[PDB]
Paper text:
The notorious pathogen [name] relies on the lectin [name] for host cell adhesion, invasion, and biofilm formation. [name] is a homotetrameric lectin with affinity for d‐galactosides. Importantly, binding to [name] is highly dependent on the complexation of a single calcium–ion present in the carbohydrate binding site.
Substitution at the second phenyl ring with small substituents was favored in the ortho position over para and meta as highlighted by 33. Additional X‐ray crystallography studies were conducted with selected derivatives of Tolcapone. In contrast to Tolcapone, here only single binding poses were observed for both compounds and no crystal contacts were found between neighboring asymmetric units. It thereby acts as a mimetic of the OH6 of galactose. However, the distance of the carbonyl to the Nτ of His50 is increased (3.8 Å) compared to the distance observed for Tolcapone (3.3 Å).
Numbering used by the authors:
A (entry chain D), B (entry chain C), D (entry chain A): 1 to 121
C (entry chain B): 1 to 88, 90 to 121
Write the structure that this text describes.
Amino acid sequence: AWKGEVLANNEAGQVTSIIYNPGDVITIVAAGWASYGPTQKWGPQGDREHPDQGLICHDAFCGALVMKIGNSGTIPVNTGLFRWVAPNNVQGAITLIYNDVPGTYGNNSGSFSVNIGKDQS
Amino acid sequence: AWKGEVLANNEAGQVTSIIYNPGDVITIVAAGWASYGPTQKWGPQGDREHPDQGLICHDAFCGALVMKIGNSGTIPVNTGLFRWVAPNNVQGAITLIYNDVPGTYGNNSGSFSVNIGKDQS
Amino acid sequence: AWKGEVLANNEAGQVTSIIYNPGDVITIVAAGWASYGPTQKWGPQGDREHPDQGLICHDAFCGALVMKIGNSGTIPVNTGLFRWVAPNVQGAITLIYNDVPGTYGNNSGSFSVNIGKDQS
Amino acid sequence: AWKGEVLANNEAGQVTSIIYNPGDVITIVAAGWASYGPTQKWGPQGDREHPDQGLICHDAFCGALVMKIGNSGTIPVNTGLFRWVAPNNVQGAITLIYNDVPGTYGNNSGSFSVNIGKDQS
Ligand SMILES: COCCOCCOCCOCCOCCOCCOCCO
Ligand SMILES: O=C(c1cc(O)c(O)c([N+](=O)[O-])c1)c1c(F)cccc1F
Ligand SMILES: O=C(c1cc(O)c(O)c([N+](=O)[O-])c1)c1c(F)cccc1F
Ligand SMILES: O=C(c1cc(O)c(O)c([N+](=O)[O-])c1)c1c(F)cccc1F
Ligand SMILES: O=C(c1cc(O)c(O)c([N+](=O)[O-])c1)c1c(F)cccc1F
Ligand SMILES: [Ca+2]
Ligand SMILES: [Ca+2]
Ligand SMILES: [Ca+2]
Ligand SMILES: [Ca+2]
Ligand SMILES: [Cl-]
Ligand SMILES: [Cl-]
Ligand SMILES: [Cl-]
Ligand SMILES: [Cl-]
Ligand SMILES: [Cl-]
């Protein structure tokens, strides 16, 4: 399992030591507070009212936690994933990233704490 | 394992199928949007800015997910618990509850979806 | 989890630390060689050729590994159980060598056993 | 997870659906009765009395269950493995094989039933 933090201001995100392989079942729990600019904070589901003006992940809100598996597209994580299997063929290291518009990360603050483990399969 | 929905307006909470037994390791993942009154909705960590005017759980924010194990006091859950073991001597049915001030649940809205499992031991 | 040895000559069995609770999923792996009397040795499934003349567990061969959960009837284990859920039963697991009561004194050897709770 | 049968007479082994990947923890349980020739049958540890006259796996008895992981050499399984991790540099599909002398599988009988699963990490 892996435990670590992902910074809201980082467009490159945080590479984990978890390698997702076909058939793997994983569990993620994410917590904390961040902002994509305003003087308020949101949890890892982000801000459900904010428009999408070019988010890296169009399937999660602005300020949400998302991931990639290897060189996949972005995949929503939000508060986490319970005994989850990837619905498409993806493989490789999990990278955690804060969902924001590229070029707009400089006014971001805060971080999410994340735990990830492989489950029985 | 258990999956279900906890209503923000349910002051009594939701008794799950899960009986926490001595030695149990559990994982909880909670998602969704709920409000303790405002138009805005929060995630399972609740609203970090709101004052505590008599929440049922003083160790979590207003609008957070919390629980009881048997007849315990409230225990924070938030976005969830990763491979977690309860305090000495706590045991019995898990009850999930929305953290609000007693008497003020009637204006609450939304729900959290929650999964609970037992981990290897 | 629990890891240990179960002695063929112990009629009373081996009380483990595992308290099986309703809904629990467990895995057991058992290995090794034991005898219920002959010079030969058998694995955890016991001796498929020996008749049952009053074994403590009628659902396993003579010389097999079996168990009880709390004060239950005997339940076959053999080489082990994969991600298994018990019938109906609650309490501590006791592992026992399947022999005819009164006939344990000529037994030899032991089985090595791992038990864990799985995800559920 | 994978559940299936390995025929004592199958010199090629039974290829499973399990791809062992670096860092995987697995559990195997094997049961049943097979023979390498005689009328008697043995369990998955095989026949402790039979000499080794050129077994595919010299670290297990004649008639034992063994495996390969990808193009590895043979690794004993016997009655099974409990939360086991492979040597480094071993990866790929698990193939289960009855331990006998090459060229002598044709007088074999019976089979083992085997379960394989990946464990938490
Ligand atoms: C962990 O330390 C906290 C210490 O709390 C002191 C103990 O308070 C016990 C009472 O909790 C009052 C909060 O009631 C909230 C309402 O729940 C309803 C559900 O109930 C189900 C259990 O039958
Ligand atoms: O969604 C955003 C948007 C998102 C941000 O995180 C952010 O920091 C800013 N910003 O401070 O200007 C704009 C946006 C955009 F990227 C282009 C046009 C209009 C916008 F609202
Ligand atoms: O924290 C609350 C408080 C909390 C609520 O969930 C709620 O629905 C209300 N309400 O709508 O009146 C007040 C509170 C209180 F309990 C007393 C005085 C002032 C408050 F804000
Ligand atoms: O199954 C057994 C049986 C089993 C034993 O392990 C053992 O040690 C003995 N014994 O030494 O008498 C008999 C048995 C029996 F109980 C009565 C008659 C014939 C038997 F083989
Ligand atoms: O161990 C074996 C051996 C093992 C077998 O399973 C088998 O079927 C036979 N066989 O029938 O030839 C020989 C062996 C050998 F390989 C050479 C000489 C003597 C042996 F028993
Ligand atoms: Ca921003
Ligand atoms: Ca309220
Ligand atoms: Ca005996
Ligand atoms: Ca043969
Ligand atoms: Cl980061
Ligand atoms: Cl939240
Ligand atoms: Cl805080
Ligand atoms: Cl696989
Ligand atoms: Cl055996």
